[PDB]
Coordinates of C-alpha atoms in Angstrom, one line a residue:
Chain A
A1 CA -5.8 -17.2 4.1
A2 CA -6.8 -20.7 2.7
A3 CA -5.6 -19.8 -0.8
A4 CA -2.2 -18.4 0.7
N5 CA -1.8 -21.9 2.6
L6 CA -2.6 -23.6 -0.4
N7 CA 0.1 -21.5 -2.5
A8 CA 2.6 -22.3 0.3
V9 CA 2.0 -25.9 0.2
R10 CA 2.3 -26.1 -3.6
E11 CA 5.6 -24.2 -3.4
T12 CA 6.9 -26.3 -0.8
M13 CA 5.9 -29.6 -2.8
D14 CA 7.8 -28.0 -5.6
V15 CA 10.9 -27.3 -3.7
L16 CA 10.9 -30.8 -2.3
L17 CA 10.8 -32.1 -5.9
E18 CA 13.5 -29.8 -6.8
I19 CA 15.7 -30.8 -3.8
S20 CA 15.1 -34.5 -4.5
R21 CA 16.3 -33.9 -8.3
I22 CA 19.2 -32.0 -7.2
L23 CA 20.3 -34.9 -4.7
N24 CA 19.5 -37.4 -7.4
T25 CA 17.4 -39.4 -4.8
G26 CA 15.5 -41.1 -7.7
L27 CA 12.2 -40.9 -5.9
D28 CA 8.9 -40.7 -8.1
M29 CA 6.4 -37.9 -7.8
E30 CA 3.5 -39.9 -6.7
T31 CA 6.1 -41.8 -4.3
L32 CA 7.1 -38.6 -2.8
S33 CA 3.7 -37.2 -2.4
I34 CA 2.7 -40.3 -0.5
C35 CA 5.7 -40.3 1.6
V36 CA 5.3 -36.6 2.1
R37 CA 1.7 -37.5 3.5
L38 CA 2.8 -40.5 5.5
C39 CA 5.4 -38.4 7.3
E40 CA 3.3 -35.6 8.0
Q41 CA 0.4 -38.1 9.3
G42 CA 3.3 -39.9 11.0
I43 CA 5.6 -42.7 9.9
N44 CA 9.2 -43.7 9.9
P45 CA 10.8 -42.5 6.8
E46 CA 13.5 -45.0 7.3
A47 CA 11.1 -47.8 7.2
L48 CA 9.4 -46.6 4.4
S49 CA 12.4 -46.2 2.3
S50 CA 13.7 -49.6 3.4
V51 CA 10.5 -51.2 2.1
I52 CA 10.6 -48.9 -1.2
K53 CA 14.3 -50.1 -1.9
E54 CA 13.1 -53.8 -1.2
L55 CA 10.4 -53.7 -3.6
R56 CA 12.7 -52.0 -6.3
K57 CA 15.3 -54.7 -5.5
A58 CA 12.7 -57.4 -5.9
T59 CA 11.6 -56.1 -9.3
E60 CA 15.2 -56.0 -10.4
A61 CA 15.8 -59.4 -9.2
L62 CA 12.4 -60.4 -11.0
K63 CA 13.9 -58.9 -14.2
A64 CA 17.2 -60.8 -13.6
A65 CA 15.4 -64.0 -13.1
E66 CA 13.3 -63.5 -16.3
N67 CA 16.5 -63.0 -18.2
Chain B
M1 CA -21.7 23.1 13.9
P2 CA -18.4 21.6 14.1
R3 CA -17.4 19.2 11.2
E4 CA -14.5 16.9 12.4
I5 CA -12.8 14.8 9.5
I6 CA -11.2 11.5 10.4
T7 CA -7.5 11.8 9.1
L8 CA -6.8 8.1 8.3
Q9 CA -2.8 7.8 7.6
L10 CA -1.7 4.7 5.7
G11 CA 2.0 3.8 4.6
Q12 CA 5.0 5.7 5.5
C13 CA 4.0 8.8 3.3
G14 CA 0.3 8.7 4.6
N15 CA 1.6 8.6 8.2
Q16 CA 4.0 11.5 7.5
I17 CA 1.2 13.4 5.7
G18 CA -1.3 12.7 8.6
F19 CA 1.3 14.0 11.4
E20 CA 2.3 17.0 9.5
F21 CA -1.3 18.0 9.1
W22 CA -2.0 17.4 12.6
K23 CA 0.9 19.5 13.6
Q24 CA -0.2 22.0 11.1
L25 CA -3.7 22.4 12.7
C26 CA -2.1 22.4 16.1
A27 CA -0.2 25.3 15.1
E28 CA -3.0 27.2 13.0
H29 CA -5.5 26.7 15.9
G30 CA -2.9 27.4 18.5
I31 CA -3.0 24.2 20.2
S32 CA 0.4 23.1 21.8
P33 CA 1.9 19.8 21.0
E34 CA 0.8 18.7 24.4
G35 CA -2.8 19.5 23.0
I36 CA -3.2 22.1 25.9
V37 CA -4.6 25.0 23.9
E38 CA -1.5 27.4 23.5
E39 CA -1.8 30.6 25.6
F40 CA -2.4 32.7 22.4
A41 CA -5.3 30.7 21.0
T42 CA -7.8 30.7 23.9
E43 CA -9.6 33.4 22.4
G44 CA -8.6 32.2 19.1
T45 CA -11.4 32.3 16.2
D46 CA -10.3 28.8 15.0
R47 CA -13.3 26.4 15.1
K48 CA -11.3 24.0 17.0
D49 CA -14.4 21.8 17.6
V50 CA -14.8 22.0 13.6
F51 CA -11.4 21.0 12.9
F52 CA -10.1 19.1 15.9
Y53 CA -11.9 16.6 18.3
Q54 CA -12.2 17.8 22.1
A55 CA -10.6 15.0 24.1
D56 CA -11.0 14.4 27.9
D57 CA -8.1 16.8 28.4
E58 CA -9.6 19.4 25.8
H59 CA -6.6 18.9 23.9
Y60 CA -7.1 20.0 20.3
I61 CA -6.9 16.7 18.9
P62 CA -7.8 16.3 15.2
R63 CA -9.8 13.0 14.8
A64 CA -6.7 11.4 13.4
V65 CA -6.2 7.6 13.0
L66 CA -2.7 6.5 12.1
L67 CA -2.9 2.9 10.8
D68 CA 0.2 1.6 9.3
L69 CA 1.7 -1.9 8.7
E70 CA 5.4 -0.4 9.1
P71 CA 6.3 0.6 12.8
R72 CA 8.9 3.2 11.3
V73 CA 6.0 6.0 10.5
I74 CA 4.0 5.0 13.6
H75 CA 6.9 5.6 15.8
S76 CA 8.0 8.8 14.3
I77 CA 4.4 10.1 14.5
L78 CA 4.2 9.1 18.2
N79 CA 7.7 10.7 18.5
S80 CA 6.6 14.1 16.9
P81 CA 6.0 17.2 19.5
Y82 CA 2.1 16.8 18.9
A83 CA 1.8 13.3 20.5
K84 CA -0.3 14.8 23.0
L85 CA -2.5 17.0 20.6
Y86 CA -4.0 14.0 19.2
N87 CA -6.1 11.3 21.0
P88 CA -3.9 8.2 21.6
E89 CA -6.9 6.0 21.3
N90 CA -7.5 6.8 17.7
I91 CA -4.0 5.8 16.7
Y92 CA -3.8 2.0 15.8
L93 CA 0.0 0.6 15.4
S94 CA 0.3 -3.1 13.9
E95 CA 3.0 -4.8 15.9
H96 CA 3.8 -6.4 12.6
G97 CA 6.1 -3.6 11.3
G98 CA 6.6 -5.5 7.9
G99 CA 4.2 -3.2 6.0
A100 CA 2.5 -4.1 2.5
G101 CA 5.9 -4.3 0.9
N102 CA 4.9 -1.5 -1.7
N103 CA 2.4 -3.8 -3.2
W104 CA -1.4 -2.4 -3.3
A105 CA -2.9 -5.9 -3.0
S106 CA -1.0 -6.7 0.2
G107 CA -1.8 -3.1 1.5
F108 CA -5.3 -3.9 1.0
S109 CA -5.0 -7.0 2.7
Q110 CA -3.2 -5.3 5.6
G111 CA -5.9 -2.9 5.8
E112 CA -8.5 -5.6 5.8
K113 CA -6.7 -7.6 8.2
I114 CA -6.5 -4.4 10.5
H115 CA -10.1 -3.4 9.5
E116 CA -11.3 -4.4 12.9
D117 CA -8.7 -2.2 14.5
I118 CA -8.6 0.6 11.9
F119 CA -12.6 0.4 11.6
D120 CA -12.7 0.7 15.3
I121 CA -10.5 4.0 15.3
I122 CA -12.4 5.3 12.6
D123 CA -15.9 4.6 14.5
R124 CA -14.5 5.9 17.6
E125 CA -13.4 9.2 16.0
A126 CA -16.7 9.5 14.2
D127 CA -18.5 8.9 17.8
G128 CA -16.0 11.2 19.3
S129 CA -16.7 14.2 16.8
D130 CA -20.1 16.0 17.0
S131 CA -20.6 16.1 13.3
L132 CA -17.8 13.8 11.7
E133 CA -18.2 14.9 8.1
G134 CA -16.1 12.2 6.6
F135 CA -12.7 10.7 6.4
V136 CA -9.5 12.3 4.9
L137 CA -7.0 9.4 3.8
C138 CA -3.3 10.5 3.8
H139 CA -1.4 7.7 2.0
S140 CA 1.1 6.9 -0.8
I141 CA 0.0 5.8 -4.0
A142 CA 3.3 3.9 -4.9
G143 CA 3.6 2.4 -1.4
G144 CA 1.7 -0.9 -0.4
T145 CA -0.2 0.3 2.7
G146 CA -0.5 3.7 1.2
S147 CA -1.9 2.3 -2.0
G148 CA -3.3 -0.9 -0.8
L149 CA -3.9 0.2 2.8
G150 CA -5.1 3.5 1.5
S151 CA -7.6 1.5 -0.9
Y152 CA -8.8 -0.8 2.4
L153 CA -9.2 2.6 4.4
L154 CA -11.2 4.4 1.6
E155 CA -13.2 1.4 1.2
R156 CA -13.9 1.1 5.0
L157 CA -14.6 4.6 5.4
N158 CA -17.0 4.6 2.6
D159 CA -18.9 1.6 4.0
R160 CA -18.9 2.7 7.4
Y161 CA -19.9 6.2 6.2
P162 CA -21.4 5.9 2.9
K163 CA -22.8 9.5 3.5
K164 CA -19.6 10.9 4.6
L165 CA -17.2 12.4 2.1
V166 CA -14.0 10.4 1.5
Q167 CA -11.1 12.6 0.6
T168 CA -7.8 11.2 -0.2
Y169 CA -4.3 12.8 -0.2
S170 CA -2.8 10.1 -2.2
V171 CA 0.9 10.4 -3.1
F172 CA 1.0 9.7 -6.7
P173 CA 4.2 8.0 -7.9
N174 CA 6.9 9.6 -9.9
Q175 CA 5.7 8.6 -13.4
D176 CA 8.7 10.1 -14.9
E177 CA 11.1 8.6 -12.4
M178 CA 11.8 5.1 -12.0
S179 CA 10.0 3.9 -9.0
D180 CA 12.1 1.6 -6.7
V181 CA 9.2 -0.9 -6.7
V182 CA 8.7 -2.5 -10.0
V183 CA 5.3 -3.5 -8.6
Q184 CA 5.0 0.3 -7.6
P185 CA 3.1 0.6 -10.9
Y186 CA 0.6 -1.9 -9.9
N187 CA 0.5 -0.2 -6.3
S188 CA -0.1 3.2 -8.0
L189 CA -2.8 1.9 -10.1
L190 CA -4.5 0.3 -7.3
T191 CA -4.5 3.4 -5.3
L192 CA -5.6 5.2 -8.2
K193 CA -8.7 2.7 -8.3
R194 CA -9.1 3.3 -4.8
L195 CA -9.1 7.1 -5.3
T196 CA -11.8 6.6 -8.0
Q197 CA -14.0 3.9 -6.6
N198 CA -13.7 3.6 -2.6
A199 CA -12.6 7.4 -2.4
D200 CA -14.9 10.3 -3.1
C201 CA -12.3 12.6 -4.0
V202 CA -8.5 12.1 -4.7
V203 CA -5.7 14.8 -4.3
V204 CA -2.6 13.5 -6.4
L205 CA 0.4 14.4 -4.4
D206 CA 3.1 13.4 -6.9
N207 CA 6.5 13.1 -5.1
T208 CA 8.3 13.7 -8.5
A209 CA 6.3 17.1 -8.7
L210 CA 7.1 17.8 -5.0
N211 CA 10.5 17.7 -5.7
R212 CA 10.4 19.5 -8.9
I213 CA 8.3 22.4 -7.2
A214 CA 10.6 22.4 -4.1
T215 CA 13.7 22.6 -6.0
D216 CA 12.6 25.3 -8.9
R217 CA 10.1 27.3 -7.1
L218 CA 11.0 26.9 -3.5
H219 CA 14.6 26.3 -4.1
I220 CA 14.4 23.3 -2.0
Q221 CA 17.2 20.8 -3.4
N222 CA 16.1 17.1 -3.4
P223 CA 12.8 17.5 -1.4
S224 CA 12.5 14.5 0.8
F225 CA 9.6 12.5 1.9
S226 CA 9.8 14.5 5.0
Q227 CA 9.7 17.7 3.0
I228 CA 6.8 16.2 0.8
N229 CA 5.0 15.6 4.3
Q230 CA 5.8 19.2 5.5
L231 CA 4.6 20.9 2.0
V232 CA 1.3 18.7 2.4
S233 CA 1.1 19.9 6.0
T234 CA 1.4 23.6 5.0
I235 CA -1.1 23.1 2.2
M236 CA -3.5 21.3 4.5
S237 CA -3.1 24.1 7.1
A238 CA -3.9 26.8 4.1
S239 CA -7.1 24.6 3.3
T240 CA -8.0 24.3 6.9
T241 CA -7.5 27.9 7.7
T242 CA -11.0 28.7 6.4
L243 CA -12.0 25.7 8.5
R244 CA -10.4 27.1 11.8
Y245 CA -11.4 30.7 10.9
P246 CA -15.2 30.6 9.9
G247 CA -15.6 32.4 6.6
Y248 CA -18.7 33.2 4.4
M249 CA -18.1 31.0 1.6
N250 CA -16.8 27.3 1.2
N251 CA -17.4 26.5 5.0
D252 CA -17.4 22.7 4.6
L253 CA -15.8 20.0 2.8
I254 CA -18.9 19.0 1.0
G255 CA -19.2 22.5 -0.4
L256 CA -15.6 22.6 -1.6
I257 CA -16.0 19.1 -3.1
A258 CA -19.1 20.5 -5.0
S259 CA -17.4 23.5 -5.9
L260 CA -14.3 21.7 -7.5
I261 CA -15.9 18.5 -8.7
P262 CA -18.5 18.9 -11.4
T263 CA -18.4 15.1 -11.8
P264 CA -19.1 12.9 -8.9
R265 CA -16.6 10.3 -10.1
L266 CA -14.1 12.7 -11.6
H267 CA -13.0 14.2 -8.4
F268 CA -9.3 13.5 -8.8
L269 CA -7.5 16.7 -7.8
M270 CA -4.1 18.1 -8.8
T271 CA -2.3 20.4 -6.6
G272 CA -0.9 23.8 -6.6
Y273 CA 0.6 26.2 -4.1
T274 CA 1.1 30.1 -4.9
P275 CA 3.4 32.0 -4.6
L276 CA 5.7 28.8 -4.7
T277 CA 8.7 30.0 -3.5
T278 CA 11.0 29.3 -0.2
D279 CA 10.2 31.3 3.1
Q280 CA 13.4 32.8 2.5
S281 CA 11.9 34.3 -0.8
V282 CA 10.7 37.6 0.6
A283 CA 8.5 39.3 -1.9
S284 CA 10.3 42.7 -1.9
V285 CA 7.5 45.2 -1.3
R286 CA 5.6 43.2 -3.8
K287 CA 1.8 43.7 -3.2
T288 CA 0.6 40.4 -4.6
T289 CA -2.5 41.4 -6.6
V290 CA -5.1 38.6 -6.6
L291 CA -4.5 38.6 -10.4
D292 CA -1.0 38.2 -9.8
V293 CA -1.6 35.4 -7.5
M294 CA -3.9 33.7 -10.0
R295 CA -1.0 34.1 -12.7
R296 CA 1.4 32.6 -10.4
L297 CA -0.6 29.8 -9.3
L298 CA -1.4 28.8 -13.0
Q299 CA 2.3 28.8 -13.5
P300 CA 3.4 25.1 -13.7
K301 CA 6.5 25.9 -11.4
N302 CA 3.7 26.5 -8.7
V303 CA 1.7 23.4 -9.2
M304 CA 2.4 20.6 -6.8
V305 CA 1.0 17.8 -9.1
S306 CA 3.2 15.9 -11.3
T307 CA 1.0 15.8 -14.4
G308 CA 2.5 14.7 -17.5
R309 CA 3.1 17.4 -19.9
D310 CA 1.0 15.6 -22.3
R311 CA 0.1 17.4 -25.5
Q312 CA -2.2 14.6 -26.1
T313 CA -4.4 15.2 -23.1
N314 CA -5.9 18.9 -23.4
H315 CA -5.2 19.7 -19.7
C316 CA -8.0 22.4 -18.6
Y317 CA -9.5 23.1 -15.2
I318 CA -12.8 21.4 -14.6
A319 CA -13.0 23.7 -11.5
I320 CA -10.7 26.1 -10.2
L321 CA -10.4 27.2 -6.7
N322 CA -8.2 29.6 -5.1
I323 CA -7.7 29.3 -1.3
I324 CA -6.2 32.5 -0.2
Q325 CA -4.8 32.9 3.2
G326 CA -3.8 36.6 4.5
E327 CA -5.1 39.8 4.0
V328 CA -6.9 39.5 0.7
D329 CA -9.1 42.5 -0.5
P330 CA -12.3 41.1 -2.0
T331 CA -12.6 43.8 -4.3
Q332 CA -9.3 42.6 -5.6
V333 CA -10.3 39.2 -5.6
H334 CA -13.1 40.3 -8.4
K335 CA -10.7 42.2 -10.2
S336 CA -8.4 39.0 -10.3
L337 CA -11.4 36.9 -11.6
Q338 CA -11.8 39.4 -14.3
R339 CA -8.1 39.6 -15.2
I340 CA -7.6 36.0 -14.9
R341 CA -10.6 35.5 -17.3
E342 CA -9.3 38.2 -19.8
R343 CA -5.6 37.0 -19.9
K344 CA -6.7 33.3 -19.6
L345 CA -4.3 32.7 -16.5
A346 CA -6.4 29.5 -16.0
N347 CA -7.6 27.3 -18.7
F348 CA -10.9 25.6 -17.8
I349 CA -12.4 22.3 -18.9
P350 CA -14.6 22.6 -22.1
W351 CA -17.1 20.2 -20.5
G352 CA -17.5 21.2 -16.8
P353 CA -19.5 24.2 -15.1
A354 CA -17.4 27.3 -15.2
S355 CA -16.5 27.9 -11.4
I356 CA -14.4 31.0 -10.8
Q357 CA -15.4 32.0 -7.2
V358 CA -13.6 34.9 -5.4
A359 CA -14.0 34.3 -1.6
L360 CA -12.3 36.2 1.1
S361 CA -11.6 34.3 4.4
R362 CA -9.3 34.6 7.3
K363 CA -6.5 32.6 8.1
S364 CA -5.9 30.9 11.6
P365 CA -4.7 33.5 14.1
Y366 CA -2.5 31.1 15.6
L367 CA -0.9 30.5 12.1
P368 CA 1.5 33.2 11.2
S369 CA 1.4 33.9 7.4
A370 CA 5.0 35.2 5.9
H371 CA 3.2 36.3 2.7
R372 CA 0.5 38.9 2.9
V373 CA -1.1 36.7 0.2
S374 CA -0.7 33.1 0.4
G375 CA -2.3 30.7 -2.2
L376 CA -3.5 26.9 -2.5
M377 CA -4.7 25.9 -5.6
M378 CA -7.1 22.9 -6.0
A379 CA -7.6 22.5 -9.7
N380 CA -9.5 19.7 -11.5
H381 CA -7.4 19.7 -14.6
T382 CA -7.0 17.5 -17.5
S383 CA -3.1 17.2 -17.0
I384 CA -4.1 14.9 -14.1
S385 CA -5.4 12.9 -17.0
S386 CA -1.8 13.0 -18.1
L387 CA -0.5 11.8 -14.7
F388 CA -3.3 9.1 -14.5
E389 CA -2.1 8.0 -17.9
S390 CA 1.6 7.8 -16.9
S391 CA 0.6 5.9 -13.8
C392 CA -1.8 3.5 -15.8
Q393 CA 0.9 2.8 -18.4
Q394 CA 3.3 2.2 -15.7
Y395 CA 0.9 -0.3 -13.9
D396 CA 0.3 -2.0 -17.2
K397 CA 4.2 -2.2 -17.7
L398 CA 4.6 -3.9 -14.4
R399 CA 1.6 -6.4 -14.9
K400 CA 2.7 -7.2 -18.4
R401 CA 6.3 -7.7 -17.7
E402 CA 5.5 -9.3 -14.2
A403 CA 7.8 -6.7 -12.8
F404 CA 7.7 -7.3 -9.0
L405 CA 5.0 -9.9 -9.9
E406 CA 6.2 -12.3 -7.1
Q407 CA 5.2 -9.6 -4.5
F408 CA 2.1 -8.7 -6.4
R409 CA 0.8 -12.2 -6.9
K410 CA 1.6 -12.9 -3.2
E411 CA -1.5 -11.2 -2.0
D412 CA -4.8 -12.7 -2.2
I413 CA -6.0 -9.5 -4.2
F414 CA -3.6 -10.8 -7.2
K415 CA -3.4 -14.4 -6.1
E416 CA -5.1 -15.9 -9.1
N417 CA -3.6 -13.0 -11.4
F418 CA -2.9 -9.5 -11.3
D419 CA -6.3 -8.8 -11.4
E420 CA -6.3 -6.0 -8.7
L421 CA -3.7 -4.3 -10.6
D422 CA -5.4 -4.8 -14.0
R423 CA -8.8 -3.6 -12.5
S424 CA -6.8 -0.5 -11.0
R425 CA -5.2 0.3 -14.2
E426 CA -8.5 0.0 -15.9
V427 CA -10.0 2.4 -13.3
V428 CA -7.3 4.8 -13.9
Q429 CA -7.3 4.7 -17.6
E430 CA -11.3 5.3 -17.3
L431 CA -10.8 8.1 -14.9
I432 CA -8.1 9.5 -17.3
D433 CA -10.4 9.2 -20.3
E434 CA -13.3 11.0 -18.4
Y435 CA -11.1 13.8 -17.5
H436 CA -9.7 14.3 -21.0
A437 CA -13.3 14.3 -22.1
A438 CA -14.0 16.8 -19.3
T439 CA -11.4 19.3 -20.8
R440 CA -13.0 18.2 -24.2
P441 CA -16.6 19.6 -25.1
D442 CA -17.8 16.0 -25.2
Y443 CA -17.8 14.8 -21.4
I444 CA -21.2 15.8 -20.8
Chain C
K1 CA -4.1 -49.4 8.6
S2 CA -2.2 -46.5 6.6
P3 CA 1.2 -47.8 6.9
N4 CA -0.2 -51.4 5.8
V5 CA -1.9 -49.9 2.7
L6 CA 1.5 -48.2 1.8
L7 CA 3.5 -51.1 2.2
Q8 CA 1.1 -53.1 0.0
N9 CA 0.9 -50.4 -2.6
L10 CA 4.6 -50.1 -2.6
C11 CA 4.7 -54.0 -2.9
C12 CA 2.2 -54.0 -5.8
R13 CA 3.5 -51.2 -7.9
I14 CA 7.5 -51.0 -7.2
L15 CA 7.9 -55.0 -7.2
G16 CA 6.2 -57.3 -9.8
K17 CA 4.5 -59.2 -7.1
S18 CA 2.9 -58.0 -3.9
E19 CA 4.2 -58.5 -0.6
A20 CA 1.2 -60.7 0.2
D21 CA 2.2 -63.3 -2.5
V22 CA 5.6 -64.0 -0.6
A23 CA 4.5 -64.1 3.3
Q24 CA 8.2 -64.6 4.0
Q25 CA 9.0 -61.3 2.2
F26 CA 6.0 -59.6 3.9
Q27 CA 7.0 -61.1 7.3
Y28 CA 10.6 -59.7 6.9
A29 CA 9.1 -56.4 6.0
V30 CA 6.8 -56.3 8.8
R31 CA 9.9 -57.2 11.1
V32 CA 12.1 -54.5 9.9
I33 CA 9.4 -52.0 9.7
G34 CA 8.0 -52.0 13.2
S35 CA 10.9 -51.1 15.4
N36 CA 9.5 -47.9 17.0
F37 CA 6.5 -45.6 16.8
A38 CA 8.7 -42.3 16.6
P39 CA 11.3 -41.0 14.4
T40 CA 14.9 -41.7 15.1
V41 CA 16.7 -38.4 14.2
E42 CA 18.1 -35.7 16.2
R43 CA 16.7 -32.1 16.6
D44 CA 19.5 -30.6 14.5
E45 CA 18.5 -29.3 11.3
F46 CA 22.2 -29.1 10.1
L47 CA 22.5 -32.8 9.8
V48 CA 20.1 -32.5 6.9
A49 CA 22.0 -30.0 5.1
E50 CA 25.3 -31.9 6.0
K51 CA 23.8 -35.2 4.3
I52 CA 22.8 -32.8 1.2
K53 CA 26.3 -31.5 1.0
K54 CA 27.7 -35.0 1.3
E55 CA 25.7 -36.2 -1.4
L56 CA 26.6 -33.6 -3.6
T57 CA 30.2 -34.1 -3.1
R58 CA 29.9 -37.9 -3.4
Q59 CA 28.1 -36.9 -6.9
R60 CA 30.8 -34.6 -7.9
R61 CA 28.9 -31.5 -6.8
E62 CA 30.4 -28.7 -5.1
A63 CA 27.6 -26.1 -5.2
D64 CA 24.3 -28.2 -5.1
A65 CA 23.9 -27.9 -1.4
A66 CA 22.9 -24.3 -1.7
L67 CA 19.7 -25.8 -3.5
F68 CA 18.8 -27.5 -0.4
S69 CA 19.7 -24.6 1.8
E70 CA 17.5 -22.2 -0.4
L71 CA 14.7 -24.7 -0.6
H72 CA 14.7 -25.0 3.4
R73 CA 13.6 -21.5 3.4
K74 CA 10.8 -21.6 1.0
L75 CA 9.4 -25.0 2.7
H76 CA 9.4 -23.3 6.1
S77 CA 6.6 -20.8 4.9
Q78 CA 4.1 -23.3 6.2
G79 CA 5.9 -24.3 9.4
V80 CA 3.6 -27.3 10.0
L81 CA 5.8 -29.8 8.6
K82 CA 7.5 -30.7 12.1
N83 CA 7.8 -34.5 11.7
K84 CA 9.9 -34.2 8.6
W85 CA 13.1 -35.2 10.6
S86 CA 12.7 -38.7 9.5
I87 CA 11.8 -37.3 6.1
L88 CA 15.0 -35.6 5.8
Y89 CA 16.7 -39.0 7.2
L90 CA 14.8 -41.0 4.5
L91 CA 15.8 -38.4 1.6
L92 CA 19.6 -38.6 2.7
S93 CA 19.3 -42.3 2.8
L94 CA 17.8 -42.6 -0.8
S95 CA 20.5 -40.1 -2.1
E96 CA 23.4 -42.1 -0.6
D97 CA 22.1 -45.6 -1.4
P98 CA 22.1 -45.1 -5.2
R99 CA 25.1 -42.8 -5.0

């Protein structure tokens, strides 16, 4: 029972990773796993994605200012 | 005293075998399909208490529990004429008609998940039977419920009744025919393991042999699963003819098991019918001698077991029991034993007790016999070691090539690896080696 | 506390400086993050497939939507991820922002 649920969850995680790769979403594995747990527990994916994009753009801007 | 047997039907093939056996028992005991005893069987010599459980309606109801995870076989059993013959309370039908998916691991999971319902029906049948002797599990070795649920039912019957004989009418898969389930090899191995471990004795009913025997001996072109179930029902009625009609020898399942199984573990039995011919094959004024019957039964065209004709495994009968239905002269039986011994009509295992018994018993009066001498052969032969080796090799081929391994590994029995299938193939290989030893002088 | 931890981790990992270093950036992220306590998406699962197909077509892919369609069936085995409407929204937004 629990083993079957764990196998289903691991298959779901692998399928989500495959879907992200096919969509070229460019989301890391740790980031995807944290966002998956956050969305299951209850959080706005749009807000989380906006914050992640803001952090990525801040990193790119910091690299540009370094250059 | 009556000795009721709890007929547990698992899978489609098992449900067909159980329903056909119940119909044959009702016909031989003269119990109508409604269970109201047929008018001709009120004074019948059939030990209806012995074979069938007496319900509140006095219906000659065999203690049969039909437990299947697919609703098709359950509906067909409930739609048979004998629906009122058996007790409805002993039939547990899983509303999830998805079955075990031809996976023995999934079948065992289904049997354990319906263990409360199925074990409830088994215990109800045991309490409803005065001297319930054990359980007979009719299932298919290649199916999921038949193999897996068959293993689960055999284990459950052994655990609830460790002192009760666990007989299995396991439909062995076609080792020479490409099974439609690539995991059917693993399912067959698991059913064989169930027969060896959670079942006290396994009668391998190889569907390939059923088709071959029906086509060649009975001239039945392409025997269907329905045909195999009907043949199983006829063979069961022949074996229970002495059960309904009280004879002088082999009056119980334990006695037959003892006379046919010199090794407690090596109780896997191959099947044969004699004379093997269609009912339209009327033996023209042919007085079937007991020796002639022995020769015809020993003829491979009359054996109902798909034992690989493996020249490596020296097939020999560990024990040979000839169940004769009809008017058979006991002096002719003794002459048959002498003639069969002289002509070597039957080859016996070199490492098992020589058991050639000639017992005269009556058939069920409600069961009409077209042949004055009808013969059912239950022989422990090392050719079953050939069939077991074929099944084990198929199981190894499925496990090693991951054939239908998605279905096999989807169940908890094989969740970590194909451990259930591997242990099943190991048990089948051990049984095959022991059976070949039994035909060899070195088994003891 | 979990959303605050997630935002701080994203700032400290994705960005070279944490969001607490510049409280203006942190204040802006809090202002744009706190809008509603519920996801903003319709109950139509087909819109997720539509966004996957649109991402494939924009990415010069005409057969990649079948991957998401097949993944849906395998991911529905658990059938307990009922709050993933926003998850599909975020995935589509991520796939369309870089594409």
